[PDB]
Design a protein around this ligand. Structure first.
Ligand SMILES: Nc1ncnc2c1ncn2[C@@H]1O[C@H](COP(=O)(O)OP(=O)(O)OP(=O)(O)O)[C@@H](O)[C@H]1O
Lengths: 244, 268, 268, 244, 244, 268
């Protein structure tokens, strides 16, 4: 079993769709993050959201392979990262690049209370083939990073209360029942659209350290705070790892 | 179907949606560098051997670059094994190891790149949209580093911290995305055998095999990294690769000319 | 009194002194890239449209690339607007926005770079490191990111947080400094009308105009960003630009040959 | 009115001509800066000075346009930044590049009490046409950045007591009267030599946050310390900022 | 004499051979370094070790000159640096590149107590000719840097008790004499194998600040701890400079 | 004997041990760019003057690059001297000065790079990994920054804070390592004299001299840095350099053909 590199870190991930809603969604989130800074040691990673779907539509209409589309989607997570870091700047927060997240994080989190980054991994041209939509997205990149460091946990912040039996906004919106708890394997065999990457379920199988990830709604304040204390406010996804 | 169907589904569906995945799976297919070939010069197979194995293959590369466009990857070799033995005993996860072995691929790229400098073939940085080295009828070649840039984000294996995706996959994955007509792996063995080449029982040379047969024969990982075979069934542009023996001169130029010398592995 | 005394004038004077500024106004004028043209591919105008508008102009660029040396800038388009709509609602100043839209100019540049890769035309690893792509008569072109690098030091506008200097100015200003004979704007409209092209029944295409008539005519921003025309009145090297329609094939090459197609805006 | 990103920051700027006077000028200024570090949160941006003129004469003698000369002068402010950063190093001070100043400043100001940089903006080849001497020089780059962050104030440290009716060094000392206070609009109309960029006067017109800037003499100690507390030791400037 | 830029810095250097001995050697040294962090302000510089000897053999077998071999070994020291920085990560430690070691070190030691880097200097292609083995290696790069900053001392951590007049692991161990104290001049006249760069003796000849350097055994716990206190546990070397 | 022998001793010996160094001193010697010439365009001698001094050498450079492969280094000049007086009086060590003087050599390189752009010759990015510019018969040239990257690790002198190793040796050392057939220094004097040249007591021009003679005649530092001579005594690929006069046109191009005008210093 490997060692935990930063066992005291809490890695949070802020959906790209949450950011797309503007100040109304974000400003309650910053005020909540300013509250969390003294309580935890936080690496906050942003997803990409709709703008990445625009690069895909354009990039897809031009025929570009998935490996060209991956770095262009990761660019938006970088843009969502720059915004959240900027609103938190006066609290000592700044956005850091992949190489600093990879190498210098422990120094920079020793300097300040938190930092911001892109959840997207630097797969850029080496992204896997088979799908025309890059398999490894923010959700997948944030877990991979949390699970290497040995962090205390990864929390996924989205615009829906959790995981449902189907897109709760989609065509079946009425027929969707909430799943307060689920396993990565049960999710990997059930089909339909998900708030998380199918690649998150694949990476969780090789997970050495992190035994759970909670998907909470960042549009309801206090759920992030409570999730980070272990209170059950959303969907608990078990990774199939045992503690010890 | 015309103006744009997805301007609805990319906005209103999750990217894990099967209804969305199919519609993206049927889109135009564009090849960025269709007339270019990628090679892998094994770190242990070729470069760690030094002048004897390397110089003949160096002479080959110059001769090929005229009629062929060449993407030259490098391998890790024994120095990457030492880093893994040291680090794996410390308990550091695969993510840490991935960047340790990438250095060694860069070292070999540097060494290999300096032998080819007088011919005008550089080592790549800030490239991949840089087609000038490949575009110039005088150079038509580049040298790069076999390892994929996953470093902390490297996908780990089922067990063990040794990085699953290495210079094979890094070189393969660069051909697949760029449309390369061929993918050649240059290693020390004639190709694939039905047993371990250095110590075997009946070993039968396999001139051709497909992935599912490789899985069959217990050959998942004999010559190439095991994920690279699963990457071979998923690849959209390069459905097959070739493993040749660099230690035998001329085989590099032959397979570049399109001959079947060595083993060829097919996705279907 | 003359232009050769300056090296005493710079030591013993402040740089805002007009006898130093006026004496600085008459020095050698050197054109670094006199035989190169800079064009702009609109992110909203052309590239955000996709294959229909993009593929034809790609064929044009290659067809043109032989007789002309080209510097291709790109524009941001709709994704930058969302970043600005999102960012401006948070209260972030223009300086923050400036780097937000720079990404999209980088994105659009990358996309275009892969369609032009097979033809040997690279994307830059920084703007002043390569004149070599232009050097090689085989390449004679480069693709870069139209956004100017002001990022946080971007000058704010009179009103609003939206960055005043954007991919239009970023492409123009590089022609001005490098000596480039022409500046061609490739967008979706034929050029200038005295009202908005999308909605006019009555709007007459203006074939030729000078700036002073333009502000006079109440067209301070129809086709180009309002400050770049002020950049045109101050320009020593590019005293005029051209705005053409990408959607109609051939307009680029014609304007590359010096034709009067589209609107032409003159500083004097 | 945008938001203040770093409202607690004090931006100071050190003219390049001050640095050109050598140890005699610098050692009093460093020792005074050693005093200020615990008192303030400081971003120190240096000007260029005479060495930027030597590249101008040469670069101008070769006919190079204004956009070619700008990156060469910004290097001098960058080198003046490296010198001052070194003498304050033992107090935890370092020189940082433009890209870290733009993205990561707040972390390093959380790491240390102050940092050094070049006041010159990264305009390099996008510097404006019309004048053969770059319009945006150290002073303009220092203000533009200060007003983006929302700094508490900008104080300019030069080798002269302030602004006079005429340069009190050149041929005419006779008509030069000191201006203890002046407005940014007044200067844009009155012509003549200035210790500051005429472009600095332009950026002040659109200034959203900082209502005043003081010009103090850095060769008489105690004037910077007092300036950072708001005491009037030199020429002030009105930028036209307001609530409405 | 020049000035001391970081007078409070302790520079330690960990031989590449110690890292090659694996978890058996490293875990005692990490745990010992975990203890020193609060006591000192430490810059830990890694050597290359065995892997660099393999790059030379190949690099030499291919005919490559000395200037090509230097950056190829410096990569190994860089890889040994990344290993140690990770094991101490949870203590706030990160590996920093040469360019930051030169400019921003003071910030990062203000952020954290320690940092890791490569002892090798960035001579890469400008390495001196005459030898087919690069003259300036980790030991020399560590001293050059220690004496540039003005550090309080440089401590060299190796796998042997100290310096012996004959190679303790190399040729005959019957005449190997341990030298509790020696001079750079005395050694510069000694021709034989040493756990030191011969170029380290050259840089010591011009040394302006550091009067002594101790070579200690990193395989015996407590010797590094004591060495940093000035206790004589290993070989002392006088550099011929007096702040005595 | 077999090129085995040093790999076990490379595994088991200290590299300061003579038995290891010797057999490593005898291996194949590979010249990375044997057919390239290195020049030094002087910071004080040449560029600090400007158009008068530069343009003639600019025009010369174009004429040679067709028949020669040229690496153009630059020097710092007076601005670096200004930085040295300022910093050395503050007490900053030699190492700090090295990075301060690196700027100006970079500055001059930038300036020179813009005069050479239309001719297609770049300034080296990414540390100079790109060999593409020299290989192309169209370009055959590069512009670089004479200063070596020692910066804070710069070896100091016995006395004083001034860095001993500067743009002279930085250009020299790149010729030595790259195999280059020639190393040319372009300065303002025809070559060597025996006095400080500015005193002009009518000293004697030395047409050819060896390093050890230089030590004899007290011409110790004279024009080339004192270490540049000791680096020449140890140098393997470039055993002699040439000192030519830039101010008199034709001296560069004649020296590029191998003519003996000017001085030459040899290791022997
Ligand atoms: N089972 C599902 N359960 C909940 N939401 C779903 C589900 N399927 C689709 N969705 C929808 O998709 C949204 C989140 O999915 P999506 O991954 O597209 O956004 P995102 O995670 O914020 O993007 P990014 O990964 O770039 O951050 C939900 O708000 C919800 O509207």
């Amino acid at each position: 079993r490997p060692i935990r590199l930063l066992p005291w870190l809490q890695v949070v991930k802020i959906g790209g769709r949450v950011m797309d809603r503007g100040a109304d969604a974000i400003l309650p989130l910053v005020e909540e993050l300013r509250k969390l800074l003294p309580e935890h040691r936080l690496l906050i990673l942003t997803g990409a959201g709709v703008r990445a779907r625009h690069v895909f539509s354009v990039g897809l209409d031009l025929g570009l392979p998935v490996g060209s589309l991956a770095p262009l989607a990761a660019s938006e997570a970088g843009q969502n990262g720059h915004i959240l870091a900027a609103m938190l700047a006066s609290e000592g927060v700044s956005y850091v690049e992949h190489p600093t997240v990879a190498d210098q994080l422990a120094i920079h989190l020793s300097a300040t209370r938190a930092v911001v980054g892109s959840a997207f991994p630097p797969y850029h041209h080496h992204e896997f083939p088979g799908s025309r939509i890059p398999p490894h997205r923010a959700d997948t990149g944030a877990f991979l990073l949390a699970d290497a460091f040995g962090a205390a946990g990864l929390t996924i912040v989205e615009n829906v209360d959790g995981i449902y039996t189907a897109d709760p906004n989609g065509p079946d919106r009425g027929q969707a029942r909430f799943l307060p708890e689920t396993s990565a394997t049960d999710l990997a065999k059930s089909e339909g659209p998900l708030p998380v990457d199918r690649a998150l379920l694949d990476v969780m199988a090789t997970a050495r350290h992190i035994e759970r990830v909670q998907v909470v709604n960042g549009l309801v304040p206090g759920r992030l705070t409570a999730a980070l204390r272990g209170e059950h406010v959303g969907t608990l996804i078990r990774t199939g790892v045992r503690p010890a | 179907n015309s103006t744009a169907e997805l301007e609805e589904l990319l906005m209103q569906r999750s990217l894990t949606d099967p209804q969305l995945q199919a519609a993206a799976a049927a889109a135009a297919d564009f090849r960025i560098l269709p007339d270019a070939t990628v090679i892998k010069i094994g770190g242990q197979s070729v470069i760690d051997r030094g002048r004897a194995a390397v110089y003949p293959l160096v002479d080959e590369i110059v001769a090929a670059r005229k009629n062929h466009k060449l993407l030259i990857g490098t391998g890790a070799g024994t120095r990457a094994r030492h880093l893994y033995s040291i680090a794996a005993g410390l308990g550091l996860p695969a993510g840490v190891l991935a960047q340790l072995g990438s250095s060694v691929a860069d070292q070999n790229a540097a060494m290999l790149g300096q032998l080819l400098a007088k011919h005008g073939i550089p080592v790549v940085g800030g490239a991949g949209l840089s087609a000038v080295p490949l575009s110039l009828a005088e150079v038509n070649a580049v040298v790069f580093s076999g390892m994929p840039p996953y470093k902390l984000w490297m996908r780990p294996a089922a067990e063990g911290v040794i990085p699953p995706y290495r210079t094979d996959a890094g070189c393969f994955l660069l051909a697949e995305q760029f449309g390369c007509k061929q993918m050649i792996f240059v290693k020390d063995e004639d190709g694939l055998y039905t047993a371990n080449p250095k110590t075997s029982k009946d070993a039968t040379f396999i001139p051709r095999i497909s992935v599912d047969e490789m899985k069959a024969k217990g050959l998942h990982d004999s010559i190439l990294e095991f994920p690279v075979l699963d990457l071979l069934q998923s690849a959209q542009h390069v459905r097959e690769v070739q493993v040749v023996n660099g230690l035998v001169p001329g085989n590099l130029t032959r397979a570049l000319a399109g001959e079947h010398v060595g083993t060829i592995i097919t996705a279907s």
